[PDB]
Nucleic acid binder design. Structure first.
Ligand SMILES: [Zn+2]
Ligand SMILES: [Zn+2]
Ligand SMILES: [Zn+2]
Ligand SMILES: [Zn+2]
Length: 111
DNA sequence: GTGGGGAAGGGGCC
DNA sequence: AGGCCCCTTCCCCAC
């Protein structure tokens, strides 16, 4: 629980305070050594490394399929079970992704 | 108008 | 203080 000196908002996490400040300046200290592409966060560079190496460690437990990223694994999991998990309370329309439900909720015409 | 890919942040655990 | 992973919303796209 720390307060950002710039936008005066509470940021939780001891080490996350420098990272949030990095979003107010646009600096990208981390740079890939192969494609020379600069990133704002280190973990994003780690994902970019997964692209170059070709590693797909996200292995489905039910069927054994391997995927590059986590969201690709999530998209495969809904095929195994729960194709359309979300729903609108008022209109009872099924949705696949949370943002898609918020898309209907952004209109908010049912409420 | 619907699905999805990727981006951009915030947080939890170690 | 930071790596590594998860989650979310949002832009923008082919269909
Ligand atoms: Zn700030
Ligand atoms: Zn690269
Ligand atoms: Zn599977
Ligand atoms: Zn609705």
């Amino acid at each position: 629980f720390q307060k950002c000196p710039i936008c005066e908002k509470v940021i939780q996490g001891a080490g996350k305070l420098p990272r949030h400040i990095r979003t107010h300046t646009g600096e990208k200290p981390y740079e890939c050594n192969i494609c020379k592409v600069r990133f704002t966060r280190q973990d994003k560079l780690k994902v970019h490394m997964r692209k170059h190496t070709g590693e797909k460690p996200y292995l489905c437990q039910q069927c054994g399929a391997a995927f590059a990223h986590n969201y690709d694994l999530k998209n495969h999991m809904r095929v195994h079970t729960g194709l359309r998990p979300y729903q609108c309370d008022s209109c009872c329309k099924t949705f696949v992704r949370s943002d898609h439900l918020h898309r209907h909720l952004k209109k908010d015409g049912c409420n």
